[PDB]
Structure 1
Amino acid sequence: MKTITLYLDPASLPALNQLMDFTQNNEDKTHPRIFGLSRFKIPDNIITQYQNIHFVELKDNRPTEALFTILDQYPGNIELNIHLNIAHSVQLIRPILAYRFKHLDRVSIQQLNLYDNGSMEYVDLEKEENKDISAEIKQAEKQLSHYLLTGKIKFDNPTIARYVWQSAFPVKYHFLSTDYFEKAEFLQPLKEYLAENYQKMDWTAYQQLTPEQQAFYLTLVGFNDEVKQSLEVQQAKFIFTGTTTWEGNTDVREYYAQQQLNLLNHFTQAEGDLFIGDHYKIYFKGHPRGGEINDYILNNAKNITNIPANISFEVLMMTGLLPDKVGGVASSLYFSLPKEKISHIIFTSNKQVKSKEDALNNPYVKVMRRLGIIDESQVIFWDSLKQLGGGLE
C-alpha cells in the first residue's frame, strides 16, 4: 500500500498547521502529497525539491474534480492521510469520499487530522445549546454512515456532524479552545465522546524545528525576514488592528482613515482613554481590504511599523512573535488571542452593532466573555472616544 497525504483548507489557521506538518516531515522528499490550500502559494523553489507533489484548487469549499486525475496516477492500493478544516470538513472530504466510493477495492481512509477555522466553530457550537447533544451526536453518526456508504449527504445537524468522524475513521482534532469544550456545560456529552481524539493546537511546534526547517516554514507561510526582524525588537510591542469603513453617515473614505487614526491616538497618547504606556513600540496591522486607507493611516502615524495583512495573528502565534498587546478595531481574529495580550477592542457602527450593548452581544464576543478572555470594560464603542491629536512621535 501507498499513503497519500492531502492538505485541504480554504482558510488560514488549518493551512498554517498543515504547512507545519509538511515542514516536520520535509526530509521525506517522495511521499505523495496533494495541497489544496487556497490562501497559500507554495514557492516554486520549495515545490521542485519534492517528487509526487500535487496541487488542487478548491471551489465552494471542495477540491475540484482535478483531484480525481491526480489520484488516478496511483493505480495500486492507496491510503489517504487527510488534513481538514473542521468547519468545512464535510464539503472538503466530499470528492475524496466520492473517489473512494468509486474505487472501493483499492482506496481507504487512513486517518483524519482536523483543525479549527477559528472562532467560526465556536460561534456555531453556541447555537446548539439546549439541544440533546448525546442524541445529536448519535444521529449524525448514523447519517455519516449513510454518507460514507450510499453517497447521500444529509445531516440533521451540520455543526455536530463536524465532530463525529471517529465513528468512521481514526481522527485527531486540534482545537483553538479546549477550555471551551471543557467549560461549556452543555457540551459535556461531546467533550466525553471526543475522548482522547482532541488536543489543543500546538503553538510551539515551530520552536522544536531545526533552524533550516524554521526557515522552510517561514517561506511556506510567506513570513519574510524584513517583517520578522521588525518583530524581534527588544521592546514592548503593541499592534493596532485596522478596519475598512463603517456607518459614519458619510461615504468619504478619508473620514474613516482619520477616525482610525483618532482611535490609535487613544492607545498611544497619555491623554487617551486607552493609553497603553509610552514604552510600547507601535505596529499597524491593516485590514486585508483596507487598501488605500491603510496608506493614509501609515503616512499620518509616522513612528508606526506596518505588518502586512498576510501575516496573520495565528502565524505570529505559530512562530512565537505575537506582540505583547493587541488592540484597535474589533474582529473575530481576537478570538484566537491569549487573554493577557488583549487590550481594548473597539466596535464600529453597522447593521447589527449600534452601541456598546450591541457589541457585547456579538457572537464571538459572547464566547470570549463566557471563557473569561475579556471583560466587558475591554469592549468599546467607537464614538464614545473624543477627538485626540497625535504626538510629535
Structure 2
Amino acid sequence: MKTITLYLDPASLPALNQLMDFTQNNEDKTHPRIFGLSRFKIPDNIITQYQNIHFVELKDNRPTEALFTILDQYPGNIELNIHLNIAHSVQLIRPILAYRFKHLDRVSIQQLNLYDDGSMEYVDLEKEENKDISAEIKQAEKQLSHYLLTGKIKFDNPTIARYVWQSAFPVKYHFLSTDYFEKAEFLQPLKEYLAENYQKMDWTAYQQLTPEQQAFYLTLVGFNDEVKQSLEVQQAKFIFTGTTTWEGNTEVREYYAQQQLNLLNHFTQAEGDLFIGDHYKIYFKGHPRGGEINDIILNNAKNITNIPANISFEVLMMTGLLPDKVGGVASSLYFSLPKEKISHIIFTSNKQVKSKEDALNNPYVKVMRRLGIIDESQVIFWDSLKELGGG
C-alpha cells in the first residue's frame, strides 16, 4: 500500500501552507507527490532532487485529466493524502473522486487537509447568516454522499458544503479566523459540528525547521535574500500598500502617482493625519500592474524600500517577516493581517465605493469590523485627506 500526497490550490494561501508541508517533509526524497499549485513554479534544481514527483495543471479550479495518467502509474493499493483550498474544495477533489470510483478496491482517501483561500470564505459565510445552519449542514452531507456516489454536484448551499467533508473522510481544516467560527452566533451549529477537526492556521512552522529547510522554503516561494535582509533590519517598519488609478476625473496617470505620494505622506510626515512616527523605515508594496506609477513613487519618496510582487503579506507572515505597521490603499489582503499591525486603510473611488460609508459596507471590511480587527476610525475615503506641501 502506497500513500500519494496531492497538493492542490489555484490561489496562494493554501499553496503557501502546502509548500510548507512539503518543506517539512523534504528529507523524504521518494514519497509520491503530485503538485497542482497554480501560482507556484517549483525550481528544476529542486524537482530533480525528488523521485515520484508529478505536476498537474488546474483548469477552472479542477486538475485536468492528465491527473489520471499520473495515478495510473501506481497500480495496486493506494491511499490518497489530499491538501485543498476550502473555497474550491468541491471542484478540486472532483477528478480525485471520479478516479476513486473506478478503483474502489485499490484506491481510498486517507486524509484531507484544507486551508482558507483567504477572506473569500468569511465573506461567503456572512451571506448565510439568515439560514438555519443546523439543517443546512444535514442537507449538505446528504448531497455530498450523493456527489460521492454518482458524481452529481448539486448543493442547496455550496458554501456550507465546504465544511461537511468529515461526513465522508478524516479531515483537518486550517482557518484564518477561528474567532469568527467561535463568535459568529448563527454559526454555532457549525462550530460544534466541526468539533476536533479545525485549527487556527499556524504561522510559526517556518521558525521550527533546519536552516537548510528554511532556505529551501524561501526558494519555493521565490523570496530573494536581498529583500529578506532588508525586512530584517532592527528598526520599526511600515509597509504602504500601493494601487494604480481610480475615479479621479482624469486620464492623467501622473495625477494618481502624485496622490498616492500624498497618501503616503499622511503616514510618513508629522504634519500628516495618519502619522506613524519619525523612526519608521518605509517600504512599498505596489500593485503588480503598477508600472511607471510604482516608478514615480519609488523615485519621489525618500529612503523607501521596494518589495517585489511575489512577496505577498502571506509570504511575510509565513516567514515571520511582517512589518510592525501596514497601511495605505485598501485591498482584501488586509483581512489576513494581525490587528495590532493595521494602521489605516484608505479606499479610493470606484463603482462600489463612492464614500467612507460605502467603504464601511465593503464585505471583507464588515467582517473585520465584526471581528474587532479594525475600528471604523481606521477606514478612510481617499479624498478626505488634505494635500500636504513638498517641504
Normalised-by-shorter TM-score class: over 0.9
Moved over 6 A (4+): none
The residue matched to 2:290 in structure 1 has which SS?
Answer: coil
Q: How far does the alpha carbon of each residue in 1:173-203 deviate from its partner, in whole angstroms, 9 at most, with x for none?
A: 0000000000101100000000000000010
Superposed, 1:355-366 pairs within 5 Å as 355-366=355-366
Deviation at 1:290, TM superposition (A): 1.6
* TM-score w.r.t. length of structure 1: 0.98
Deviation of 1:390 after TM superposition, in Å, equals 4.4
Query: How big is the shift at 1:291?
Result: 2.3
Q: How does 1:263-342 map to 2 (within 5 A)?
A: 263-342=263-342
Q: Write out per-residue CA displacement over residues 253-287 of structure 1, whole angstroms, 9 at most, x where no aligned residue.
A: 22211111110010001110011000000000111
Asked if 1:94 corresponds to 2:88, the answer is no
Give distance in 1, aligned partners of 2:191 and 2:331: 27
Residue 389 (structure 1) shift: 3.3
The CA deviation string for residues 197-242 of structure 1, in whole angstroms up to 9 with x for no partner, is: 0000010000011111111111011111011001001100000000
Distance in 2 (alpha carbons) for counterparts of 1:291 and 1:99: 45
| Secondary structure in 1 matching 2:335 | helix
- Output the CA distance in 2 between the equivalents of 1:152 and 1:265: 55
DSSP 3-state at the match of 1:173: strand
Q: Percent identity?
A: 99
Contact 1:238 1:281 in 2 (8 A): yes
* CA distance in 1 between partners of 2:159 and 2:124 (Å): 7
User: 1:99 and 1:289 mapped to 2: Cα distance?
Assistant: 40
Secondary structure at 2:18 match in 1: helix
Contact 1:269 1:390 in 2 (8 A): no
State the distance in 2 between where 1:105 and 1:156 align. 31
Indicate whether 1:184 and 2:195 are aligned: no
Cα pair 1:101 1:151 within 8 Å, conserved:
no
How many angstroms does 1:252 deviate by? 2.1
Deviation at 1:372, TM superposition (A): 0.5
- 2: CA distance, partners of 1:298 / 1:58: 36
**CA–CA separation in structure 1 for the residues paired with 2:227 and 2:289:** 19
Judge conservation of contact 1:24–1:213 (CA < 8 Å) in 2.
yes
Instruction: Give 2:3's aligned residue.
Output: 3
Cα distance, 1:390–1:231 mapped onto 2, change above 3 Å: farther
What is the alpha-carbon distance in structure 1 between the residues aligned to residue 307 and residue 5 of structure 2? 33
Following the alignment from structure 1 to structure 2, what is the Cα–Cα distance between the partners of residues 326 and 23? Answer: 28
1:75-105 deviation line (CA, Å, top 9, x unaligned): 1111110000000100111111111112222
**DSSP-derived class of the 1:267 partner:** helix
1:214 aligns with 2:214: yes
Structure 2: runs of 5 or more not aligned: none
Q: Distance in 1 between matches of 2:131 and 2:25?
A: 41
Q: Normalised by the size of structure 2, how large is the TM-score? A: 0.99
Distance 1:107 1:93 in 2: 14
Hey, what's the Cα distance between the residues in 1 that align with 2:32 and 2:389? Answer: 57
Q: What is the root-mean-square deviation of aligned Cα atoms in Å?
A: 0.8
Deviates most, 299-308 or 110-119: 299-308
How far, CA to CA, are the matches of 2:8 and 2:252 in structure 1?
40
1:292 deviation in Å?
2.4
State the aligned residue count: 391
8 Å contact from structure 1 (residues 265, 389) kept in 2: no
